[PDB]
Design a protein around this ligand. Structure first.
Ligand code: NAP
Ligand code: NAP
Lengths: 286, 285
């Protein structure tokens, strides 16, 4: 009961359009590569010939593109067709690029919402699916239901860049943690321990991290009471990891980066504070 | 019952000695700072007057010291008393330093078990604690007393293995903690409290349920890159670097991740699964 346009027919976009179509929403679609639409048009989507047609076809225009450079390459030549439309950009990019695009959309008559999808293309439309949303609350509340088709709707604030900040911070946890798991698996692997043999121990390590609330409370108070886990303690242990990694013939760049941050914080006088104090150097460029 | 000596009465050694004592073992203790044994001695522990008498008091000698340098400083002047003893070094150090110490102990007639303790001092004695052990399987099998401290997790004969497993677990711990704090600082740049983002970060960690598929890929050495290629990850890491830069936060951690992705792409893995990054992590630059 709401027309929807989907610019961007990549794995993600195709999934969104299909979910919109399977929810019964009128769906118009466009893509630099039309062949990517043959499937949805066969399922009942309208392949627009131009970007202008797609934009006019619906007020709600959801964008799933590689990056914002792609958006501007698509939409700028049709910028005079953006008036009245609501652009919901779900493409990954920087917060600042989102705040710049929001201003660009405004000057061209369009409203702008930023979105960060937290599921793979296949996950779109499942209970585990949720999308960070930021921008004008009224515009969000006006199109929440339509967007819920794709997954949970999580409005995080008015700043257009906030949704992407949340997304980037989550991927910052993800990729860095994945690299740590691979580095540790390589370390034990240097003595012939299969990855599937270390997996139980790695898995239980992550289940042991049930104290993040305490750390978050420390950060939010700006107080890092030392007690059972000084930063100096972690610094000594990180040195053992660096030295073990070297001895084992594996890469040392990752543990060395962690070590240098600990040294920064100790030089700043947090050695006796809780290791949460490390955030104080993480927030300050060296 | 079965005597046990504990050398090193810092927070961990004090907790280990207490556990042995509460479990009914005869316990002899030694520490460079003797005041730290007072509370234990008041409960039945024997304060050895000399390191060598501590070694002689029990065949099983548990060491809980800062590093292996502390061990040699303590034990070398008394190396002739190591004969017949079983040294169980629960001190954190490198796998190579463990192998070296095992050879030194054998030169003095002592057997050697390496241990890696995966709980803080308050965690000793819970059945939910565990300790990696490596060294002669017959020596580990003969020394029930160790279970007083927590689970006994024997990883093999190589004396370096227990510390290898331990350093790898701590590798995950500290790097993941650094990532959590950096990401928390990133959203905090715009005033999002850590306690508001934590629910989302917790979901992230609870969503890591594919590590098995990664484990099988590593063991096969096959990194089928179809769904999530390394190139796609690198592009995401670049946005993270740039967002961190724009936010005024330190970029060293994300730049370190970015450099590893670049190395893997330069090794031909751009279109492989992100697990292929292990091929650069297994080899120095
Ligand atoms: N799970 C996820 O994959 C996920 C999660 C969160 C966010 N995102 C964001 O959503 C995007 C889309 O998901 P994806 O990675 O599956 O697909 P993708 O490969 O990034 O496809 C992006 C889309 O952008 C289009 N495009 C790129 N450059 C263009 C240009 N110069 N002119 C016109 N169109 C251009 C592509 O058209 P063609 O099809 O013709 O190449 C394609 O439809 C991601 O790149 C990311 O930015 C994805
Ligand atoms: N959460 C934890 O505390 C924890 C958890 C798991 C593993 N570990 C590991 O277990 C070991 C024990 O740690 P801990 O918590 O007890 O604190 P610690 O400060 O590492 O232990 C200090 C102990 O080592 C002794 N020592 C240090 N340098 C010495 C030297 N040069 N000569 C003689 N004795 C020396 C101290 O003697 P004095 O007491 O006389 O000063 C004391 O008995 C460490 O290797 C640590 O990495 C700790």
């Amino acid at each position: 009961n709401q027309p929807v346009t989907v610019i961007g027919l990549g794995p993600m976009g195709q999934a969104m359009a299909g979910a919109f179509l399977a929810a019964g929403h009128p769906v118009t679609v466009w893509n630099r590569t039309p062949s990517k639409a043959d499937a949805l048009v066969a399922q009942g989507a309208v392949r627009a010939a131009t970007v202008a047609e797609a934009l006019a076809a619906s007020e709600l225009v959801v964008l799933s593109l590689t990056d914002y450079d792609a958006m501007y390459a698509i939409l700028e030549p049709a910028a005079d067709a953006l008036a009245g439309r609501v652009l919901v950009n779900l493409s990954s990019d920087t917060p600042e690029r989102a705040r710049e695009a929001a201003a660009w959309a405004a000057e061209h008559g369009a409203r702008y919402l930023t979105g960060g999808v937290m599921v793979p293309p296949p996950g779109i439309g499942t209970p585990e699916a949720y999308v960070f949303y930021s921008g004008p609350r009224e515009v969000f509340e006006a199109h929440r239901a339509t967007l819920a088709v794709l997954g949970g709707t999580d409005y995080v604030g008015e700043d257009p860049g906030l949704a992407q900040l949340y997304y980037q911070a989550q991927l910052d946890i993800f990729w860095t943690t994945m690299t740590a798991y691979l580095h540790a698996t390589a370390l034990v692997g240097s003595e012939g321990v299969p990855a599937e043999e270390f997996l139980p121990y790695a898995t239980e390590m992550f289940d042991s991290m049930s104290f993040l609330e305490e750390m978050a409370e420390q950060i939010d108070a700006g107080e890092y009471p030392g007690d059972e886990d000084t930063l100096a303690m972690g610094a000594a242990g990180v040195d053992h990891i660096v030295h073990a990694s070297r001895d084992a013939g594996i890469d040392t760049a990752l543990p060395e980066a962690v070590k240098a941050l600990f040294r920064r914080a100790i030089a700043a006088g947090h050695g006796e504070d809780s290791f949460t104090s490390l955030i104080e150097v993480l927030r300050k460029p060296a």
